[PDB]
Scaffold this active site. Structure first.
Site, PDB file in Angstrom:
ATOM      1  N   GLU A   1       0.831  -1.163   0.000  1.00 14.27           N
ATOM      2  CA  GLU A   1       0.000   0.000   0.000  1.00 14.27           C
ATOM      3  C   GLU A   1       0.891   1.248   0.000  1.00 14.27           C
ATOM      4  OE1 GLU A   1      -3.970   0.470   1.971  1.00 14.27           O
ATOM      5  OE2 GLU A   1      -2.584   0.900   3.658  1.00 14.27           O
TER       6      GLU A   1
ATOM      7  N   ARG B   1      -4.435  -4.626   0.602  1.00  9.67           N
ATOM      8  CA  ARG B   1      -5.767  -4.051   0.310  1.00  9.67           C
ATOM      9  C   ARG B   1      -6.086  -4.004  -1.165  1.00  9.67           C
ATOM     10  NH1 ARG B   1      -5.049   0.227   4.764  1.00  9.67           N
ATOM     11  NH2 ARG B   1      -5.945  -0.863   6.586  1.00  9.67           N
TER      12      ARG B   1
HETATM   13  N1  LIG Z   1      -8.561   4.299   0.728  1.00 10.41           N
HETATM   14  C1  LIG Z   1      -7.992   4.330   1.943  1.00 10.41           C
HETATM   15  C2  LIG Z   1      -7.031   3.378   2.269  1.00 10.41           C
HETATM   16  C3  LIG Z   1      -6.431   3.458   3.524  1.00 10.41           C
HETATM   17  N2  LIG Z   1      -6.790   4.423   4.384  1.00 10.41           N
HETATM   18  C4  LIG Z   1      -6.225   4.541   5.734  1.00 10.41           C
HETATM   19  C5  LIG Z   1      -5.333   5.784   5.867  1.00 10.41           C
HETATM   20  O1  LIG Z   1      -3.995   5.288   5.921  1.00 10.41           O
HETATM   21  C6  LIG Z   1      -4.081   3.923   6.334  1.00 10.41           C
HETATM   22  C7  LIG Z   1      -2.950   3.061   5.779  1.00 10.41           C
HETATM   23  O2  LIG Z   1      -3.177   1.688   6.157  1.00 10.41           O
HETATM   24  O3  LIG Z   1      -5.358   3.440   5.933  1.00 10.41           O
HETATM   25  C8  LIG Z   1      -7.760   5.350   4.005  1.00 10.41           C
HETATM   26  O4  LIG Z   1      -8.052   6.208   4.829  1.00 10.41           O
HETATM   27  N3  LIG Z   1      -8.348   5.311   2.804  1.00 10.41           N
END
Ligand SMILES: Nc1ccn([C@@H]2CO[C@H](CO)O2)c(=O)n1
Ligand SMILES: Nc1ncnc2c1ncn2[C@@H]1O[C@H](COP(=O)(O)OP(=O)(O)O)[C@@H](O)[C@H]1O
Ligand SMILES: Nc1ncnc2c1ncn2[C@@H]1O[C@H](COP(=O)(O)OP(=O)(O)O)[C@@H](O)[C@H]1O
Ligand SMILES: Nc1ccn([C@@H]2CO[C@H](CO)O2)c(=O)n1
Lengths: 227, 242
Positions: free
Chosen positions: A34, A95
């Protein structure tokens, strides 16, 4: 021909850790991380991750589009040139474009951090972006790492990312219920019909890593031989 | 992609849709992809297949109006959706129009290049978009172009040149509700960007072929009857050069 497995779970559940461990078992196995480093320094640039946490009603839509875009870009690049001169290639995604939309963005919408116009645009953008660019990205399976919101809160302090240190427990509880509804109760429906037949492996990761990691790695090997 | 792609560029209310909707009537091999302005003023995403049988497609927000009302808040959001909806419309007509044409030509009302190099760039230059927003927008727009490669590349551009004052008057004539508060100063800024890109050709783009794409400049300051003939003739001549 590459098997695409998404690793899902709350913030700081332990996904990069576990997956960086798991990668070493086969030359055939690779990870797409990620792109949190790109989010924290927009390119030194802006910290759009921090902007979203400090001013979510202002920066959420902007963060979410950049987040999803950076992920698709990175996932497509690993598919196109990596492995493939490999017996049984596996790609693990930290993810997916589905959690981007149905967990995180959806939660910002339910929190009133994105308005109805922003949310409608996000969904239109996501629908179109995926129907084109993201066909090669369909998941063969999903690994769900579950850890309680208290564990995830502890692991946020332990890891020490500055942008995250003010995350309240209640925020993590909301993201947890959404994962559970998606991946455990399976009551959360997407507008992607193939997703309902994608096999899910749920792994409990609430314990310290000496406790269970052998059983977990082995369960992943069991799970992958089935696909 | 034997289809020739010609974009029609020029300021707001220059007369681009009026001209091209009349022009395309001269051949069955000529079609037009309109600018999705209606999609911007009435924002809608696709219904579920079962929900649409019992639920109407409701009128959503007006992100066009939001951008005009608070550009500093809504510019990035408007421009991202403005470009997405255009690319979606342009590619669909490429995939499905003019399959039985002998010399097919697709006219695009504006292009992805003017989205970025005229409109979004002017918003950045006016500080309606900040540095992070401008960086994200450009990164997105770049990545998307790479992905198509030569899919939407233009064989030519027709520039409809009209003074700011003409456009301003034509905005009034047309009567599009969200455009009625637009000051002459805004139109004049957009005017200077088209002239740099399209006339003086000093504006630099990340897309190298544009530096040599054939361009036809037409003056549309006069009332429609008065010059339509010469215009149609310049256009037919231009098209045979490609
Ligand atoms: N689309 C996403 C993906 C991840 N996040 C949050 C914000 O940062 C963390 C990193 O794991 O996860 C998020 O807020 N929005
Ligand atoms: N099983 C575990 N036991 C103790 N700490 C863990 C465990 N798994 C991960 N961690 C630690 O918790 C933090 C978050 O893990 P990380 O892999 O970065 O989470 P994620 O990738 O899910 O956001 C890191 O400090 C990491 O060392
Ligand atoms: N040459 C012209 N003379 C008089 N009216 C024109 C002329 N060209 C366009 N119009 C009118 O001006 C308005 C704007 O034209 P339109 O084609 O909608 O502009 P654009 O597509 O560039 O925004 C419309 O009311 C149209 O009838
Ligand atoms: N990318 C674009 C394209 C067009 N516009 C303005 C706003 O909408 C009118 C329609 O001509 O023009 C714009 O503001 N931004």
């Amino acid at each position: 021909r590459i098997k695409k497995i998404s690793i899902e779970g709350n913030i700081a559940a332990g996904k990069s850790t576990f997956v960086n461990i798991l990668k070493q078992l086969s030359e055939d196995w690779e990870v797409v991380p990620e792109p949190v480093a790109r989010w924290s320094n927009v390119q030194n640039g802006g910290n759009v991750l921090q902007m979203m946490y400090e001013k979510p009603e202002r920066w959420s839509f902007t963060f979410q589009t950049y987040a999803c875009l950076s992920r698709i870009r990175a996932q497509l690049a690993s598919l196109n040139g990596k492995l493939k001169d490999a017996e049984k290639p596996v790609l693990f995604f930290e993810r997916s474009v589905y959690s981007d939309r149905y967990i995180f963005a959806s939660n910002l919408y339910e929190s009133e951090s994105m308005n109805e116009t922003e949310w409608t645009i996000y969904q239109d953008w996501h629908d179109w972006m995926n129907n084109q660019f993201g066909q090669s990205l369909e998941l063969d399976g999903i690994i769900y790492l579950q850890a309680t919101p208290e564990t995830c809160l502890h692991r946020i302090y332990l890891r020490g990312r500055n942008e995250e240190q003010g995350i309240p427990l209640e925020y993590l509880e909301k993201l947890h219920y959404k994962h559970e509804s998606w991946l455990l109760h399976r009551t959360l429906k997407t507008n992607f019909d193939y997703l309902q037949e994608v096999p899910i492996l749920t792994l409990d990761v609430n314990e310290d890593f000496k406790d269970k990691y052998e059983s977990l790695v082995e369960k992943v090997k069991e799970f992958l031989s089935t696909l």
